Scaffold this motif. Structure first.
Motif, mmCIF file in Angstrom:
data_model
loop_
_atom_site.group_PDB
_atom_site.id
_atom_site.type_symbol
_atom_site.label_atom_id
_atom_site.label_comp_id
_atom_site.label_asym_id
_atom_site.label_seq_id
_atom_site.Cartn_x
_atom_site.Cartn_y
_atom_site.Cartn_z
ATOM 1 N N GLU A 65 54.649 60.149 93.513
ATOM 2 C CA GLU A 65 55.343 58.938 93.097
ATOM 3 C C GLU A 65 56.259 59.226 91.916
ATOM 4 O OE1 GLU A 65 54.962 55.303 94.007
ATOM 5 O OE2 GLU A 65 54.489 56.232 95.934
ATOM 6 N N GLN A 117 59.258 60.667 93.384
ATOM 7 C CA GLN A 117 60.065 59.598 93.953
ATOM 8 C C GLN A 117 60.784 58.810 92.871
ATOM 9 O OE1 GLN A 117 62.078 58.246 96.411
ATOM 10 N NE2 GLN A 117 60.289 58.461 97.750
ATOM 11 N N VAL A 150 65.068 58.499 93.180
ATOM 12 C CA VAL A 150 65.821 57.211 93.239
ATOM 13 C C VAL A 150 66.649 57.090 91.957
ATOM 14 C CG1 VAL A 150 65.630 54.749 93.785
ATOM 15 C CG2 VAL A 150 63.790 56.297 94.446
ATOM 16 N N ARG A 157 69.999 58.274 92.402
ATOM 17 C CA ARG A 157 70.768 57.690 93.496
ATOM 18 C C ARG A 157 72.201 57.358 93.108
ATOM 19 N NH1 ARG A 157 69.786 55.713 98.594
ATOM 20 N NH2 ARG A 157 70.992 53.867 99.207
ATOM 21 N N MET A 194 47.737 58.811 101.498
ATOM 22 C CA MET A 194 48.813 58.352 100.625
ATOM 23 C C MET A 194 49.737 57.461 101.446
ATOM 24 S SD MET A 194 50.064 57.839 97.907
ATOM 25 C CE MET A 194 51.609 57.174 97.303
ATOM 26 N N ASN A 207 52.633 55.982 101.116
ATOM 27 C CA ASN A 207 53.904 55.909 100.422
ATOM 28 C C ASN A 207 54.909 55.407 101.435
ATOM 29 O OD1 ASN A 207 56.002 56.047 98.579
ATOM 30 N ND2 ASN A 207 56.113 58.286 98.583
ATOM 31 N N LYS A 267 61.052 56.373 101.574
ATOM 32 C CA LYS A 267 61.866 56.351 100.381
ATOM 33 C C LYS A 267 62.884 55.213 100.437
ATOM 34 C CE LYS A 267 64.778 59.873 100.976
ATOM 35 N NZ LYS A 267 65.105 61.218 101.484
ATOM 36 N N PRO A 268 62.995 54.477 99.402
ATOM 37 C CA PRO A 268 63.457 53.088 99.466
ATOM 38 C C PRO A 268 64.716 52.875 100.288
ATOM 39 C CG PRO A 268 62.868 53.866 97.239
ATOM 40 C CD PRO A 268 62.256 54.783 98.176
ATOM 41 N N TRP A 269 65.823 53.488 99.869
ATOM 42 C CA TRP A 269 66.991 53.692 100.715
ATOM 43 C C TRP A 269 67.282 52.599 101.752
ATOM 44 C CZ3 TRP A 269 64.973 56.870 97.610
ATOM 45 C CH2 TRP A 269 65.737 57.966 97.106
#
Lengths: 54, 51
Positions: free
Chosen positions: A4, A7, A11, A14, B44, B46, B49-51
């Motif tokens: 995390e 991650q 982002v 980005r 996990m 998860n 990925k947001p995107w």
């Protein structure tokens, strides 16, 4: 946890996408602009040399 | 043969019926075998990925 955390930084990065688009915008703009400047410079030079040539 | 003495049969039947069906079954029920520790090093959720 760290995945995390990974991650998070990803982002966080980005924002590169947008500025690159911006980069192409300002670039292509000056391109067409300068291209226009040399189009007009070439065309008037052409007529100028044409008359002095003949 | 003392085994044939039908006078003293219930004093053998009763305590056996008590210790075989109630006490021993309980002393078993207390003996439990937990499932083995299985630390899962893969779990996990998860999201993409947001995107």
């Amino acid at each position: 946890i760290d995945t995390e955390k990974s991650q998070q930084a990803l982002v966080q990065k980005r924002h590169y996408l947008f500025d690159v688009q911006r980069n192409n915008i300002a670039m292509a703009l000056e391109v067409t602009y300068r291209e226009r400047l040399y189009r007009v410079y070439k065309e008037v030079k052409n007529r100028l040399d044409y008359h002095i040539s003949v | 043969m003392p085994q044939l003495n039908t006078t003293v049969w219930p004093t053998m039947i009763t305590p056996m019926l008590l210790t075989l069906f109630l006490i021993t079954q309980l002393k078993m029920l207390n003996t439990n075998y937990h499932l083995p520790p299985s630390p899962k090093p893969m779990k996990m959720k998860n999201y993409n990925k947001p995107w």
